[PDB]
Structure formats: structure tokens, C-alpha cells
Amino acid sequence: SHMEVVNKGDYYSIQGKYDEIIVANKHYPLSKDYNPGENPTAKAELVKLIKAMQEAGFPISDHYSGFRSYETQTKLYQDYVNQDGKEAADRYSARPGYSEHQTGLAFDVIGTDGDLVTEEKAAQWLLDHAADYGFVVRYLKGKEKETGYMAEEWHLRYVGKEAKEIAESGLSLEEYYGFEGGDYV
């Protein structure tokens, strides 16, 4: 079953159960020019999700950290490095050409905040119902050695129909699909 990854040029991808699954992480970088914008299918699903969360009573904004280009990433990374250094920045912020946001398939929900109890309720809601809309929480709790990054409640990755199966496993995409993760080089 373990399928090896296929280079499409600008990006690597692996053939999922129903769809082609683009792979972007510290081990699998994207090209510099790759500037797709946001995915219109994923975009339409996130919008539905946000309304479900808002109508559920959670303070969730109408805007989100969706697509980020290489260029945007270059300026975003170095600022976080300035803030905490390089060893601490690398734990939650990808280098230019390694960010899932560059694919157009990854979006960070914004909460506006901040009751804490309300945040964690919202974070659990995602875990329980993000698959319904083809999304998965990418950077799960206690999976930093596999994914490369520490846990992040708000970063969703559109995978589509297989989101439910992936969530039920409790695995990272690296573990589930069996492609490499970890650190750089």
C-alpha cells in the first residue's frame, strides 16, 4: 500500500484513496515560483465551516490566513526568527518554500479571542467536525517529530473525502500516507 511520492515539477504529490494529495513539509519543498492562489473547492468548504462555527456561537472571524506566497513567507519567517531566534522559530514557522500555505490548501482560522475556555472548545470542535468539510488538523498533539512542527489547533489542511478516515486513525498525514517528515536536509 505504501505508495512512494511522485514529483510533478513544482510540487510533490501522493495518490490518495480518492484524490491526489499534494505534499509540502520540511522534507518535501515547493518551487519558488509556485503561486497557485487559494483552492476554490477548499475555499468553498472553509466558508461553510466558518459559518457553522459562528452559528454554533464561537467567536470566529470572517477572515483567515489562507494562501501565502514564497515572497510573503520570506518576510514572515525572518520576523519570527527576530522574535524568538531560529531554533524556536523553526518549531512553528516554515522556511520559504516549505509552507503548506503556499499550496493554496491550508488555512488558519482566526478566533479574535479570548476566553481560553472558548478557544479550547473551538479547538475541539475542529477535531470533531473538520473532516465533515474535507479538512484535517495538520499539526496534532504529540506529533512534532513526525510533522516537524509543534501542535497547532487552527491550521487546517484540505484533503477532501478521506479527511474522515485520516481523523479516525489519529495519525499525521506523514504516518497515514507513509511519506517522510521530520526535519530539513
Partner: peptide
């Protein structure tokens, strides 16, 4: 922290 925490964006990857």
C-alpha cells in the same frame, strides 16, 4: 507562537 504557534501559522507551517
Amino acid at each position: 507562537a504557534x501559522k507551517x
